[PDB]
Each structure stands twice: as C-alpha cells, then as structure tokens.
A paper describes a structure:
Cryo-EM analysis of this sample revealed two distinct LGR4–RSPO2–ZNRF3 complexes with stoichiometric ratios of 1:1:2 and 2:2:2, corresponding to a heterotetramer and a heterohexamer, respectively. In the LGR4-RSPO2-ZNRF32:2:2 complex, another copy of the LGR4*-RSPO2* complex was bound to the other protomers of the ZNRF3 dimer, ZNRF3* (the asterisk indicates the second protomer in the dimer), forming another set of 1:1:1 complexes, thus completing the C2-symmetrical 2:2:2 complex. In the LGR4-RSPO2-ZNRF32:2:2 complex, the TM helices of ZNRF3 protomers were visible in the cryo-EM density. The two TM helices of ZNRF3 were loosely sandwiched between the two TMDs of LGR4, especially between TM1 and TM7 of one LGR4 promoter and TM6 of the other LGR4* promoter. In addition to the ECD dimerization of ZNRF3, these intermolecular contacts in the membrane restrict the spatial positioning of the TM helices of ZNRF3 and bring the intracellular region of ZNRF3 into proximity, which may facilitate the auto-ubiquitination of ZNRF320,28,29. In the 2:2:2 heterohexamer configuration, ZNRF3 ECD and TMD are largely enclosed by LGR4 and RSPO2, resulting in steric hindrance that prevents ZNRF3 from binding to the FZDs, thereby suppressing its ubiquitination activity. Moreover, no apparent contact was observed between the two LGR4 protomers within the 2:2:2 heterohexamer.
LGR4, along with its ligand R-spondin (RSPO), potentiates Wnt/β-catenin signaling by recruiting its signaling suppressor, E3 ligase Zinc and Ring Finger 3 (ZNRF3), and inducing its membrane clearance. ZNRF3/RNF43, LGR4, and RSPO form a ternary complex on the cell surface, which relieves ZNRF3/RNF43-mediated suppression of Wnt/β-catenin signaling and thereby potentiates pathway activation.
Residue numbers in the entry:
A (entry chain D): 706 to 822
B (entry chain D): 283 to 473, 520 to 564
C (entry chain E), D (entry chain C): 57 to 246
E (entry chain B): 40 to 143
Write the structure that this text describes.
Amino acid sequence: FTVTLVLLNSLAFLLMAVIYTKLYCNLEKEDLSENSQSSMIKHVAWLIFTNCIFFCPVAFFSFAPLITAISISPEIMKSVTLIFFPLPACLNPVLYVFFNPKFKEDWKLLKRRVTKK
Amino acid sequence: PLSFVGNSAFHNLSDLHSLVIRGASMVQQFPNLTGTVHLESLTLTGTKISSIPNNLCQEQKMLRTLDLSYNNIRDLPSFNGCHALEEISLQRNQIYQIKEGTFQGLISLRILDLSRNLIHEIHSRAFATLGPITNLDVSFNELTSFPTEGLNGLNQLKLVGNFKLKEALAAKDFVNLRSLSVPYAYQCCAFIHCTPSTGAFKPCEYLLGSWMIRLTVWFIFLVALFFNLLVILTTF
Amino acid sequence: ETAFVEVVLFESSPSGDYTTYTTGLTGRFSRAGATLSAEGEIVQMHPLGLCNNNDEEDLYEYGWVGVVKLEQPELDPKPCLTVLGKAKRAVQRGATAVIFDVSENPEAIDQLNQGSEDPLKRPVVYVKGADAIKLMNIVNKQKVARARIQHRPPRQPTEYFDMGIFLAFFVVVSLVCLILLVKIKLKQRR
Amino acid sequence: ETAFVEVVLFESSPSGDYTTYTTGLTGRFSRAGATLSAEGEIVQMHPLGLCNNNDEEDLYEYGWVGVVKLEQPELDPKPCLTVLGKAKRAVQRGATAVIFDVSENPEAIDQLNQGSEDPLKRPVVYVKGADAIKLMNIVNKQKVARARIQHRPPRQPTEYFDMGIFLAFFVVVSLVCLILLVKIKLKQRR
Amino acid sequence: CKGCLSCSKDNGCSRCQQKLFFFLRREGMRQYGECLHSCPSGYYGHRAPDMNRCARCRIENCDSCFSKDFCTKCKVGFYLHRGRCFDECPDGFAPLEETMECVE
C-alpha cells in the first residue's frame, strides 16, 4: 500500500513537473531572453527530469515482485536499489556547480568572504 | 474411545511385549507398571500425567521406543538405565528445564524430540554422554544459549521458533550435520542444507556484494558530501 | 525443476563384463521431495501395496527406485493413504526415490505440489503421457533395470546484458532530454 | 568440480523399515570421468584385483561404487595397469562410479587429470588426507554401506552487476575528462 | 600380516614372499591380500616368476583342482573321471563309492 501511494504521488509529480516545464517553454519572453533566472530554471529542469530518470527504474523493480510474472533474483533488486536510490541526489550538486553561472557568482562571493575572513 | 484406565491395570503381565494407549484423557497418573518388565515399546498420548516414576529405566530394562507426547510432563527424571532405549519423544509438554544428568548414559539413543515445550535452560553437558544421536528437535521453545558438546554425530537438527536464540553455532561441533532450520537465517551463514536460506536480501560477510561496488558507494558518498557542503557554503 | 530419467538395461556377459542400453525420460521434480539426484533399480509397486502396515513380508534391500501407477480416483473412493503418505511409506521401506505415473489421476500433480510442510529427503518425480506409457511398457516387459534420476543444473545467467543495456536506454534518454533542452536553447540563440 | 560424498549405513528393523546414519566427505571430480551424480553400494577393491582378465570368478551386480586405495608407487615398480586402465576395467565390471584413495600416491592426481582423450561416462573421484582416512576407517569396519555422490551446481553469477560498476567508472571518468576541459574553459572565461 | 613383504593396514598384504601365493579375500566390502603356502579349496595355485597367484577352479562341480580344468576331487554325486566330474561312470567304467570315483 505504501509503495502504491508513493508511486501515485510520483506519477502525479512527474506529470505536474512536465506540465510546468512545458509552460516555461511556452513562455516566449523568458525563453528567447538570456535572463540569469533561466539558468537556474533550466538547472532545476534537468534536476527534476533526472530525478525520475534515475528513480523510475527503481519503481519498476519494486513493482516487479508485485507483477510476479518474471523470476527475479534477489540480487538484481538489491543492486538496483543500492545504486539508483542514492543516485538522483549525489549528482545534483555537481550539476548545479558545473552547469550554472549563478553558482559561479555565488562562488565568487564565497571567495570574497573567505579572503575577507 | 478410551476415556479412563485403571491405575494398576497392567501389572504382572511378564510378557506383554507392547502397550499403546491413546486418547485416555481422564488418566492422571502413570500406570503402575511394576512387574511388567518386557515392554519393548510404550506410548501414552493425550493424558493428564504430570510426572514419571523414577524406576522406569530400572524396571523396563529392555525398553526400546518410548513416547509421552501431548501430556503435562513438567520435570524429567533421570533416564540412566534404559541402555537399549532408542527414540524418545516428549513434544507438546510443560517441560521447562533440562538438567545435565537427565540423558546420562543413553548409549543407543537415535531420535530425540522436545519440540513445543517451555525449555529455556539446557545444561552445558546435557548431550556429552550421548551416542549416535541423529535427529534432535527443540523447535518452538525459549532457548537462549545452546550447548553443543558431544553432538558432532548429529545429522538433522531444528531450532525454528526459538526467538530468544539470537546467537549462532560453531561448525566445529556440527561436523556431520546435514539439515538445519534455525529461527534467523543469519545463524546459517556460518555454514549444508539450511532453512531459511541466506539470500541476497540478507548477505553473509559483505553488505555490498563484491569489491569495486563498495568503491562505487564510497565515491558516491564522498562526492555527494563534498559538493553538497560546497553548495551550502556558496548559498548561505 | 525438470527431472531427467535414464533407464539402464544391463546384460551379463558370461566373461563378467556388463553391456548397457539406456532410454531417456523426462519428469517433473514434485515439491513433496527435495530436488536431488538418485540411482537404483526399479521396483514397481501396486498402489494398494503401500497402505499395509506389515512390511515384514516384503523386506526389500535399500536403494530401490520405486514406481507406482496411480489409477482412476473414483476407483478407490475410500483412499487408504494420501499420495504423500504413499511416498513416505515407500521411503520408510528403503526406497531411494519414488516415481509416480499420474497419467490417469492428473489431480495427483497438484496434490503433491500443494502446501505440505513436510518435504522428503528423497526426490519424488511424477511423469505423464508418452513418457509414462514408455516407462510402463519397459517395466512390464524387461527383467532387471536400473533407473537414474538426474537434476540438470540451471541455465545461463542472461542477467548480464539486462542492466547495462537497461542503463544504456537510461543514459541515452537522459542525454536525449538534455539535448532537447539544448535544442530549445539553440532556438533562443537563433 | 568438487564432489560431495555421503556414506549411508543401514539397520534393518525387523518390522521392515530402514534406519540410516550418514557421514560427509569431499573429493574432486577427476578429469578422466564425467562430472555427474551416481549412487551405489561400496565395494572396496584391491589395486591388484583389477588387471586380471578373468572376471567370471567374481561377477558382481550392476551399480556398485568401487573404492580403491593406491599404494607406494615404488611398491609396484612393474605397474600392471595405468590408473585410467583400472577405472576402465572397474566400469567394465558394472561399477557405476569409482573412488580412489590417492593419499599415498599423490602423483595419481595429475596422472588422472592429465590429457586423456577418452573420458568415461561414469564419474571418477579421488580423495586424500582426512577424508581418505575416514573413508578407509568406515569401509574396513561396517558391513553394508551405500555411497551417494553429488555434483554441486555452480554458484551465483556475480558477473551480473560487475559491469554496472565497470561502466560506472567508465562513465564517471569520461565525465571527469569532459569536466576538466570545461574547467579549463572556465579558466579562459576568467 | 604374515609372510608379507609389504603389509598395509587398509589393504592387507600387497606383495607376498618369493615362494608364496597371493590371494584376495572378499568379506563384506573389505577386500585384502593374503599369503598362503597353498591356495584354498576351489582354487589352483598358478605359479609365476613375479608373483604367484590363485585362480578360481573354472571346471564345474569341483572343490579342489590341480589346474584350470583338472579337478582332483569333485563334489558329492559326481564320480571323478580323468579329473572331470560326471554323475555316472561312463561306458567302460563303473561307479566305486568307497573312494567315490570312476573305476574300470
């Protein structure tokens, strides 16, 4: 029951995140412009996409026992859960660090604060 | 449909070669079997017997098979004397403690069973004097510490239901063991046949499968920590 | 889980050597018995020859692969023993494995494979159809035969390619999502 | 490739039932014999009791797990037969499997496992050391015993998820290569 | 382990003396060598330059045989005739019970 509930909110979330990103794309003003806000807009866009890009298979493997149609060895779900559950998190800070000029400005501020420290 | 049997209703039968009684609920004492010294087999189930006469092994010298299941047996008297006895089954009784000398000198014992009792304390040297015991059964009991001395000859063993048994056993004392059923699968990680199996859900020595996977999660953890802390620094 | 049975017909040469001719068979390891490998001479037994509780008339030597042919279930409206009871009795008698011909009583398959928390240390195999009739034809025609029960090990682990190619679509799709956004970015550039 | 051997004894109850007590053993399936599972009663044989070409004195029944104890190699400077010859002869006599005690002639291990393009349909197992002395002690003590030989199936395929971590380093390192160049690009930007 | 060049506990004797017969005894599963000055009933001592071994008397109805086919004395109910066992004394020969063998 808890797994079904978490999937239900996951699919509703994925749908509403996709709808919101589509709405952002439909906004011509922010799209064609080179505003700095769009940097973190796209950033959270890629983050929100990769969240289920890495978690949807975990859901597939969790429902695999529920389908009980394929003989799944314990090791396969063990490995996929241990590798793909922490995966969507550990890479988000890297993506923001190395794919956002706003983070570069924040890092310049941090360097200034360290030097004045 | 045997309801009640007279207390002294089987004595003096100096050649009664067997005796089986079942369903005698109204019986509340062990029968006064003195004189009947040629009972190869004996059975008494579904009766309200509380204890056993102590001279049992001194009277039925050539007793071979004995069974006292489904009774209210509480205290086990000394069994020294039934040197030809082979099987004992006392399951579904109120037996609560086991002393060292209860099984002293049961040379020919082969099958033993105490399942579904209240035994929790087994003396360390309980099985030291045992012979070629093959099946031992103490499933569904309150064991906490399991002695293993003088048990290497066992072939089959069960401990399922012993929740208080949170420990494991050394393979050095179970040389000839074949089948085992322990309450927790981790108790089977030390070793052939086992129940329940130690599946990939519950590994034995490495939580992360093989090497280079531990390295994978190591790298994941270090990069997540470092990048996250740098992000907090920059943001706040 | 399938059982591979070979029936060996040895003939004694006068010099002392043995000549063997074997025939193949395939059954299914029933849940009532552990899926192991056994070997022993075939001793066919009547279905009604197991309920009896006086074995002293038929003390057999150990290691005999018994064979039973179950019959019409209505033909025995008062069943002396359950099928599992028959298997237990056979194993008590020194059998090393038991084979049932369920060609006429198909419900015995689910009767054996149903929930029974008392599995037997020796394998139990049920056959049906062409293999069953072949076994009956050889049993009631030859004089001595030794049967061998073989448990084929499992097959190749196709799991290898499964997740790397799975990750291949995952990586490809994730990159596809990334480049689709980049294509939008290029559209803004134009 | 390891062979697991169970030695089962009997005590025929007068009622007709059979009581058993088994002991474990571990050998190695030698290359000279196909790795399979066989079962049969133990019939110990002298090393010199095989090369003789007159079996009519001692015709045995089919399916007997022979046991041999090889001795000091210098004690037989004129070897009547090779070890493989002994195994072939034993199989001719109707043996279903052969077990060698090489505890005293260790070179027999490589003699059996060496290049022999004539493998035997029945398994050949050689034991040595504690298991060998245990087997000799039981054989020369009991009266009737039945030996069961088991071929353990292979273990888990860790090959499954080793590529996932292998490709994980590969993808991470390739990302490292790309990101270092991006770091150089950012240095040019500054 | 008597009269044995090399006796092992598990396999009994394995090389009899120079002038002795190497015989294999079957008991249960246990089979082991022995050294005897003369092979027992039902066997004929076959000499050799390497090791001298006993072999089964292949001639039927025989309890003691001098060679592979010459029986010194048959079992009961078979008179001896040129080392061969016959229930009846053939033509030119009559039964003789006192020594249980065929006479002229």
